[PDB]
Amino acid sequence: HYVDWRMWRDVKRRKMAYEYADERLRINSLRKNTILPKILQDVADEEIAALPRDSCPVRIRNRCVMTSRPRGVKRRWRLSRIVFRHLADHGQLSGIQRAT
Amino acid sequence: LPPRTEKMAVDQDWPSVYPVAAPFKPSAVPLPVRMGYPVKKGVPMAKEGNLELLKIPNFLHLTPVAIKKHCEALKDFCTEWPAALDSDEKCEKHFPIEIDSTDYVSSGPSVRNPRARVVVLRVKLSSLNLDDHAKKKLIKLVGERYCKTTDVLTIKTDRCPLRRQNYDYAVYLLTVLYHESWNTEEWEKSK
Amino acid sequence: LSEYAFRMSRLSARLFGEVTRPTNSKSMKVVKLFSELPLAKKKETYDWYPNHHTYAELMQTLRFLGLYR
Amino acid sequence: HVFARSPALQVLREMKAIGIEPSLATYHHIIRLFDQSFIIYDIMNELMGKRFSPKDPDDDKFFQSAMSICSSLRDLELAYQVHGLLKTGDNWKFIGPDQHRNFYYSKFFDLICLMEQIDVTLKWYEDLIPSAYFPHSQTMIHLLQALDVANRLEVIPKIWKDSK
Amino acid sequence: LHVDVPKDLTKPVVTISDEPDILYKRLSVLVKGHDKAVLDSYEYFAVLAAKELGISIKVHEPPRKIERFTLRVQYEMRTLYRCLELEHLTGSTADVYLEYIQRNLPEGVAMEVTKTQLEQLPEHIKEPIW
Amino acid sequence: RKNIFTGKRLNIFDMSLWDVEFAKQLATVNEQPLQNGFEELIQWTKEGKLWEFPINNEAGFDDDGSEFHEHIFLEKHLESFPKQGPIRHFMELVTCGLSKNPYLSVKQKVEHIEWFRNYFNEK
Amino acid sequence: EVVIPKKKTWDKVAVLQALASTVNRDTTAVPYVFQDDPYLMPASSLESRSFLLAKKSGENVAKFIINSYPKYFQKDIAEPHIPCLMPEYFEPQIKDISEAALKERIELRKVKASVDMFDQLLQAGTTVSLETTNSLLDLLCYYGDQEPSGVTWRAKNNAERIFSLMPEKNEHSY
Amino acid sequence: HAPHYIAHRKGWLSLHTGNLDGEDHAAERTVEDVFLRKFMWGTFPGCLADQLVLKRRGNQLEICAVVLRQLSPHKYYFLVGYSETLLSYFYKCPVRLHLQTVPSKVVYKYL
């Protein structure tokens, strides 16, 4: 019952990103040090690659939570400019006023 | 039905009408107060039906009468500042250590704030039993935590999740710093 | 640096719980990786969206029960 | 009924002697047994100033029953004593459900109107109504009769506005 | 109430423990709002309560903060501050006063209470180890 | 003319679901409607619905009753690892990071270290 | 001579109770349970009772919805956790034929299920603990072979059958 | 009054600490506000004479609404009880409604 297919895809990504985060961090930690032998770093490059592609934290987009807009999103409110302006102009966003 | 403000005497006990914080009730507040930007050849809108008066965080539950009555009843919970401590000159003498901790009151379903775990310990090195070498070593160990102008060592702990754990860690840090300032290793002579 | 300064710094780094054994810039990434909670485990990330199933199916149930228009 | 009065008093004396304290339920039972009536004076005299806690399911039925007696005896000082007991501490929590509350207050206010000076009757009228209860039409008739007896006929308009 | 008054009242139980009470040298109360009039009313209330409880209080106004941004249409957020410095009050007075003024905190106003507890040296730091 | 508390007595004496239900019946004896706003706040606080003042930001959270030394000194879990190899330097970095983490519990940090132990063991 | 004072302790609701003791009852208002709006203030005792019953019925409908669909109210956002604002579970979770499921059904006051499972345990040859059968017989005797909402003791009711079947009848049973 | 009078003549319908400098959870409060407004407008159809006012103090949530005297008081009480319970269990906080009836829409002018 999400806004559209694109939002549902991003909700799917954020789920697996949460589940795989600890394992990714640990395997990623092995490859980011100049101590362990190169034999081990080369394999963790294979271990990290084999993990499901949507688990990568770089494939998550900050879509609007009400319109699923891909861009124009203020992260502090998770709302696109069009939805923000609607709420801010009606005085329904506490503390927000038009500047003078 | 008619509003009950018609039944209120002019010498009633107002704190009983608004004991706690409540939104503005025009049928309970017996004031002809008006709020609104008036129209041309107009008057500010009356209280009945006024949303602007309904948007004010009013202080009808805290009037001077009510504040005094509340603060008279709350005296029983207080304890007395020890008279010996007249000013800071004696507070810093009898209690050298100062522990700063902060609490945050927001509005929401959750009370957790991550900034409340930070603890700050402040102690003047002149109030510690340090000789010359001990003081020098302590200063060199602490680094920028020590300020020469004020003679104050400031240890800010935020490692642990809780605040009690950070306070314990700050006390432990002070103890270990003192004891290792009072120790002389072999490499010391290589100064 | 100096023998005295080097030992003093390596002792202060043992009292305060920093990296005692010498290390380089690339290797200090592990410390940052494990000191901070990863982005994918932040409550701004995994709970960025409202449910939209709880919110939408609750309306469905409410209207079917005749308590919402 | 009447065969039970001395045995019940004997049982109360036994319970006191054994070291088991009476509750509001016990006094309620004794009062309702005797009312079918000067034991209420001693019961009150023993209860004055005391604070109670819920020990039996029937405790909440005391005050109602007690008030009933004060109405039948037409003893206003006893009514004030019972009300003062109710006002001591957290005693008010024993007034019971709304039906019992209305019964208690209606009998109480009827007694005030019948026996008290009219100005104190008006003070009780404003303090008790509508904050404590909503009056019954019989209470309005009683209040009007009290005003008639006290010859304060300037007040009927306000009373009728209130009844409306 | 004119006649129907409570005969006796159950005052709360406040037990005097045997443990020592905390001492707070200072207690800084920073209240933030979007509205200056609410902060002024809250200043009046807090100061009056402090005077009535015997606490030593001094008030000042930190400079305001203005976050401007643009979506053109330019929006703004003002944050105004009021600082109440209480001084030389114990742990129990601090608890009761803070509960009172936090329970009476008006909507839209956030609070940050910084508490500077006074403590003695640990016995482990009185003298060096041999 | 004498009180009813003097006179004859029986002279006999001298000095589960059922019980919870009897307690619930006793509760109904003083079950009255709320009388004013303070009573409502008192009841909500007793139920646990309202925050207890003065606000404590760590209310209901005790970190499993752990102490500071269980968060900051995690090098007692590195006993099973190589004691002087590059693995020791790496795990020293890992524990230095984990000791500066206020967002994890001791259990999660030891779980990290145990994952590392197992992984290095397989290799 | 720094004489540090002794700490005073009090219950979490002491301050509210002191403030409440400051304020007295309002003579010109209806009880707090109603709303001060003139259109909604009850004007008669019958009207007051009717309004209270309506409010309670609304609360009951909301409770029915919440318990009927816990999946929409399981998401917890309150710190500290509030147990009284979570859905209640009235359904058995243990489904196998075992004494623990019987104890579960007795805890849930599900009379008919408990009787049926006691019969099924008898059929499965599983010997029941004395305490468990005493708990069952508590439930049956209190509720009189009816589910939760007088009931006249019906001869040969389930309590009597269970009681007669008991291998050992201790004082608690009688 | 137009949007550029929001801090000059009008106020803010919702009041909370989220948008203050240094505070957190602004987005959560905004989403809560949106659901509250939709829910109330669907649970009180044709009753609300004006906008809701959503106030937040500590853990509390006060919906101060202005309604009409068209619906019967019994239905108002039923809906208030239902809404209080449902919103309290949905947000895990003690919600509370503060209906204020007016005879009809409080007209200010004729735009």
| Residue H17 touches chain E, beta carbons under 8 Å | yes
Contact assessment for residue H62 and residue H96, using Cβ atoms and an 8 Å cutoff: yes
The CA–CA distances, whole Å, from D48 to B123, D31, D45, D73, D83 equal 61, 16, 6, 19, 11
- Nearest CA distance, G125 vs chain F (angstrom): 27
Instruction: Find the CB nearest H101 among G39, G63, G73.
Output: G39
- Name the strand (E) or helix (H) holding E117: strand E110-119
State how far the Cα of H94 lies from the Cα of H85, in Å rounded to an integer.
9
- In 3-state terms chain G splits into helix, strand, coil percentages (rounded to 5) of 50, 5, 50
Which of B:98-127 have CB within 8 Å of E?
98-107, 123, 127
In this complex, whether A and D touch, counting 3 or more CB pairs under 8 angstroms, is no
3-class DSSP state for residue D23?
coil
- Nearest CA distance, G88 vs chain D (angstrom): 28
| DSSP conformation class of G170 | -
Q: Which residue has the tokens 């404003």?
A: D126
What dihedral angle (degrees, nearest 10) is formed by the CA atoms of F98, F101, F102, F107? Answer: -30
State how far the Cα of B105 lies from the Cα of F56, in Å rounded to an integer.
9
Contact assessment for residue G73 and residue H89, using Cβ atoms and an 8 Å cutoff: yes
Query: Which residues does G88 contact at the CB level (< 8 Å), separation at least 6?
Result: G67
DSSP codes of every residue in H13-66: SEE-STTSTT---HHHHHHHHHHHHHHHHHHSTTTBSS--EEEEETTEEEEE-E
Structure tokens at A50: 């084999």
| DSSP conformation class of B186 | G
Strand E74-90 relative to strand E23-33, pairing: antiparallel
State how far the Cα of B104 lies from the Cα of H24, in Å rounded to an integer.
11
**CA-wise closest residue to F93 among C29, C64, G46:** C29
State how far the Cα of H111 lies from the Cα of H101, in Å rounded to an integer.
24
3-class DSSP state for residue F43?
helix
Q: Of how many residues is chain D composed?
A: 164
Query: Which residues does G151 contact at the CB level (< 8 Å), separation at least 6?
Result: G144, G145
**CA-wise closest residue to A91 among H48, H39, H37, H44:** H37
Instruction: Find the CB nearest D9 among F7, F13, F14.
Output: F7
Which own/partner pairs from F113-120 qualify as long-range (CB within 8 Å, at least 24 positions apart)? F113/F74, F113/F77, F113/F78, F114/F77, F115/A26, F116/A26, F116/F91, F117/F80, F117/F81, F119/A26, F120/F81, F120/F87
State how far the Cα of G104 lies from the Cα of B183, in Å rounded to an integer.
65
Instruction: Find the CB nearest H53 among B36, B45, B54.
Output: B54
Would you call F89 and C37 a contact, using CB atoms and an 8 Å cutoff? Answer: no
CA atoms within 13 A on the CB side of G106: 24
- Residue C20: count other Cβ atoms within 10 Å of its Cβ: 14
| Residue B144 touches chain G, beta carbons under 8 Å | no
Partners for G (CB, 8 Å, 3+ pairs)? B, C, D, E, F, H
Query: Which residues does G113 contact at the CB level (< 8 Å), separation at least 6?
Result: G92, G105
Q: Which residue has the tokens 């106030």?
A: H55
CA atoms within 13 A on the CB side of D116: 21
Instruction: Find the CB nearest C4 among B141, B176, B190.
Output: B190
Amino acid identity of E70? T
State how far the Cα of G50 lies from the Cα of G69, in Å rounded to an integer.
29
- Cα-flanking dihedrals φ and ψ of residue E79, to 5°? -125, 115
Amino acid identity of A47? E
Would you call E111 and B104 a contact, using CB atoms and an 8 Å cutoff? Answer: yes
Where would I find the beta strands (DSSP E) of chain B?
A: 97-105, 119-124, 146-147, 152-157
State how far the Cα of D82 lies from the Cα of F3, in Å rounded to an integer.
18
Contact assessment for residue D59 and residue D24, using Cβ atoms and an 8 Å cutoff: yes
Would you call E7 and D88 a contact, using CB atoms and an 8 Å cutoff? Answer: yes
What dihedral angle (degrees, nearest 10) is formed by the CA atoms of D82, D85, D87, D93? Answer: -100
State how far the Cα of E94 lies from the Cα of B79, in Å rounded to an integer.
9
Instruction: Find the CB nearest E114 among B21, B81, B102.
Output: B102
- Nearest CA distance, F16 vs chain B (angstrom): 37
**CA-wise closest residue to E27 among E100, E118, E105:** E118
CA atoms within 13 A on the CB side of F2: 4
What residue in B sits closest to H1 (Cα-Cα)? B37
- Name the strand (E) or helix (H) holding E25: strand E23-33
SS (H, E, C) D28-65: HHHHHHHCCCCHHHHHHHHHCCCCCCCCCHHHHHHHHH
Instruction: Find the CB nearest G7 among E4, E19, E99.
Output: E19
Q: How was this structure determined?
A: cryo-EM
What residue in H sits closest to C55 (Cα-Cα)? H35
Residue in B12, B72, B78 to test binding to E, most E beta-carbons within 10 Å:
B78
| Residue B82 touches chain G, beta carbons under 8 Å | yes
Residues of chain E found within 8 Å of residue F55, distances taken between Cβ atoms = 102
Contact assessment for residue D135 and residue D107, using Cβ atoms and an 8 Å cutoff: no
| Residue C41 touches chain A, beta carbons under 8 Å | yes
SS (H, E, C) chain C: CCHHHHHHHHHHHHHCCCCCCCCCCCCCHHHHHHHCCCHHHCCCCCCCCCCCCHHHHHHHHHHHCCCCC
State how far the Cα of F99 lies from the Cα of F82, in Å rounded to an integer.
20
Phi-psi domain of F63 (left: phi exceeds 0; alpha: psi -120 through 50; beta: other): left
Residues of chain B found within 8 Å of residue F56, distances taken between Cβ atoms = 103, 111
| Residue B174 touches chain H, beta carbons under 8 Å | no
**CA-wise closest residue to D54 among D85, D79, D91, D18:** D91
Q: Could you tell me the resolution of this structure in angstroms?
A: 2.8
| DSSP conformation class of E115 | E
Name the CA radius of gyration of chain B, rounded. Answer: 29
If 0-12 CB within 10 Å is exposed, 13-18 middle and 19+ buried, where does residue C69 land? exposed
Partners for A (CB, 8 Å, 3+ pairs)? C, E, F, H
State how far the Cα of G37 lies from the Cα of H71, in Å rounded to an integer.
14
- Nearest CA distance, C6 vs chain F (angstrom): 19
State how far the Cα of B47 lies from the Cα of B52, in Å rounded to an integer.
9
Residues of chain H found within 8 Å of residue A93, distances taken between Cβ atoms = 12, 14, 19, 30
- Residue A86: count other Cβ atoms within 10 Å of its Cβ: 14
CA angle E45, E48, E51 (to 5 degrees): 150
Query: Which residues does A49 contact at the CB level (< 8 Å), separation at least 6?
Result: none
State how far the Cα of E12 lies from the Cα of E18, in Å rounded to an integer.
19
3-class DSSP state for residue E2?
coil
**Cis ω for the linkage preceding D130 (within 30 of 0):** yes
Which own/partner pairs from E92-96 qualify as long-range (CB within 8 Å, at least 24 positions apart)? E92/B77, E92/B78, E92/B79, E92/E21, E92/G7, E92/G8, E93/B77, E93/B78, E93/B79, E93/B81, E93/E53, E93/E55, E94/E22, E94/E24, E94/E27, E95/B77, E95/F54, E96/B74, E96/B77, E96/B78, E96/E53, E96/G15
